[PDB]
Design an enzyme around this catalytic site. Structure first.
Site, mmCIF file in Angstrom:
data_model
loop_
_atom_site.group_PDB
_atom_site.id
_atom_site.type_symbol
_atom_site.label_atom_id
_atom_site.label_comp_id
_atom_site.label_asym_id
_atom_site.label_seq_id
_atom_site.Cartn_x
_atom_site.Cartn_y
_atom_site.Cartn_z
ATOM 1 N N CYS A 96 4.374 1.586 9.310
ATOM 2 C CA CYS A 96 4.632 0.684 8.078
ATOM 3 C C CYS A 96 5.693 0.073 7.694
ATOM 4 O O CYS A 96 6.604 0.998 7.182
ATOM 5 C CB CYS A 96 3.419 1.015 7.084
ATOM 6 S SG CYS A 96 1.630 0.962 7.755
ATOM 7 N N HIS B 71 0.941 -1.185 0.019
ATOM 8 C CA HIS B 71 -0.081 0.036 -0.050
ATOM 9 C C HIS B 71 0.949 1.190 0.144
ATOM 10 O O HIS B 71 0.221 2.229 0.206
ATOM 11 C CB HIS B 71 -0.932 -0.153 1.380
ATOM 12 C CG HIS B 71 -0.135 0.000 2.575
ATOM 13 N ND1 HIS B 71 0.248 1.245 3.022
ATOM 14 C CD2 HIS B 71 -0.319 -0.748 3.475
ATOM 15 C CE1 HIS B 71 0.397 1.065 4.300
ATOM 16 N NE2 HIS B 71 0.175 -0.432 4.501
ATOM 17 N N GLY C 60 3.295 6.331 9.833
ATOM 18 C CA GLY C 60 4.490 6.026 8.919
ATOM 19 C C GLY C 60 5.007 4.743 9.543
ATOM 20 O O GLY C 60 6.292 4.241 9.011
HETATM 21 AU AU LIG Z 1 1.136 3.317 7.268
#
Ligand SMILES: [Au+]
Ligand SMILES: [Au+]
Ligand SMILES: [Au+]
Ligand SMILES: [Au+]
Lengths: 301, 301
Positions: free
Chosen positions: A145, A41, A143
């Site tokens: 991820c 993503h 952030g």
């Molecule tokens: Au994220």
């Protein structure tokens, strides 16, 4: 003596963390050899997350749309592909800091360390467990991820987890490094609830053994029990069923302490039925379940 | 979301850990620039620890009696000296992995990460607090002496602790990197008891603010209180007295949540007088005191 939830030394993983940007989205990537792994993503807008068609969003991207920065230096992207829920970005330079490593898919109840990262920079490290419902109770702000979970065996780093999602309940979901989610979760901002969060029985038992080894003995009682009788109690308190495989994994701890596994189950049964009466075990007022039997042995040895 | 006790990334410290041997004794050293720092009781036999005369034991040693091994390579020792309770071994090679660093002496109640090491090899990392009685509740098996505690500010590592002793009570004592013990402890195997282990009030308050920020709000009540009234309650429950300096350090968390510091003190008072009634806060059944206000801000930001 003493018992603390310890994470693995993070240095080998720090040297692999990079920043990956695609359009307006930035997250963390893992740079091993000449491949950079990150959550797919990264190609989504905040708006696309309602209902992304990843294949269609990905055709609008070329190699030069993926910005990859290791520290203060830019990597050159020479190929890109999607493997399940992760993107693999082929770069032209092998990471000189690549450790010996493996990709493994762990089982529920196993533990690993997480190196929480932001914008490709390491922030902190902590030890956690894959819950029986395939969530983790983590610390992931916007952030983080692409931050990864791992175990270290001597010099080899076994990567087992990549952070992808925060669920509306506040728990975290992610994938192995082949991009397959743990559990039923998908990379879409939609209603997905976790099933029942059961306690990892074999880990609680391991932790009770650790407690004995370190001198906290008050909870040991004069009873014993049977597997089926304990498991009736386990079911009532949403504990994972205990198998003979679990009894076997606890064998070395039973040997070290001279306390039969079924004796310890009867201690656990009484703690489940009576509570702790305002007492503590290893500094905790709850039954701790994020130490595996292997962890306990490792830390005591 | 989520709240976890996180340690600093350990990589910068892993690259400084070495093995130091003198006669039959092995422990951990810290290699920074061309100096290796280690506990002076590396020069003691297990028998000498009853009553060591360190100055007299040290005259029997020359540079070549100190074996220093970084990984699988031997350092050449060109000078040695004793500074308080640490030995400084001058070697002929500067550690190429030396980070930017400082030596700091921390205050009781402050937190730091420990990189637990054995034979110069990193084993695990965990976050802890200097207790008000200058002990730490650590995980130190035989050989972990010389393991160090630190904080990282961007790229600079502030070393604040070196492990020296396990006390007969199971708690740990050590020094700053200038070799001065925290607290009244000495490097001798003798009866030394720790004073009263009080709870770090300003840290509990910070953790209560973290809980609010993450959605656990049940403990917030309708009362307020005064500093003197709260401090009467604190004294009864062996909590550190709260000062206006502490109220000030909590200011940003008060601002973020819109909960006055004295309102939160009254919530804390009721938890101290009523217990938690079988409830939890941030997954814990006890009041957690090893997060500083700065930690909470750092992790939430
Ligand atoms: Au994220
Ligand atoms: Au491997
Ligand atoms: Au510095
Ligand atoms: Au030692």
């Amino acid at each position: 003596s003493g018992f603390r939830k310890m994470a693995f030394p993070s240095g080998k993983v720090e040297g692999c963390m990079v920043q990956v940007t695609c359009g307006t989205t930035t997250l963390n990537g893992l740079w091993l050899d000449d491949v950079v792994y990150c959550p797919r993503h990264v190609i989504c807008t905040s708006e696309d997350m309602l209902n992304p068609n990843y294949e269609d969003l990905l055709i609008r991207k070329s190699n030069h749309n993926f910005l990859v920065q290791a520290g203060n230096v830019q990597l050159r992207v020479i190929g890109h592909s999607m493997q399940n829920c992760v993107l693999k970005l082929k770069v032209d330079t092998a990471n000189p800091k690549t450790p010996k490593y493996k990709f493994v898919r762990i089982q529920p109840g196993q533990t690993f360390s997480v190196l929480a990262c932001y914008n490709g920079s390491p922030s902190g490290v902590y030890q956690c467990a894959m819950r029986p419902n395939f969530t983790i109770k983590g610390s992931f702000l916007n952030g983080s991820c692409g931050s990864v979970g791992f175990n270290i065996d001597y010099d080899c780093v076994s990567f087992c987890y990549m952070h992808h999602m925060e669920l509306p309940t506040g728990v975290h979901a992610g994938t192995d490094l082949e991009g397959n989610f743990y559990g039923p979760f998908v990379d879409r901002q939609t209603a997905q609830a976790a099933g029942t969060d059961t306690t990892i029985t074999v880990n609680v038992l391991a932790w009770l053994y650790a407690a004995v080894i370190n001198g906290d003995r008050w909870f040991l009682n004069r009873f014993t029990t049977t597997l089926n009788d304990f498991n009736l109690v386990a079911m009532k308190y949403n504990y994972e069923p205990l198998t003979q495989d679990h009894v076997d994994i606890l064998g070395p701890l039973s040997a070290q302490t001279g306390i039969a596994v079924l004796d310890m189950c009867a201690s656990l049964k009484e703690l489940l039925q009576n509570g702790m009466n305002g007492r503590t075990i290893l500094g905790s007022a709850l039954l701790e379940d994020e130490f595996t039997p292997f962890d306990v042995v490792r830390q005591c040895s």
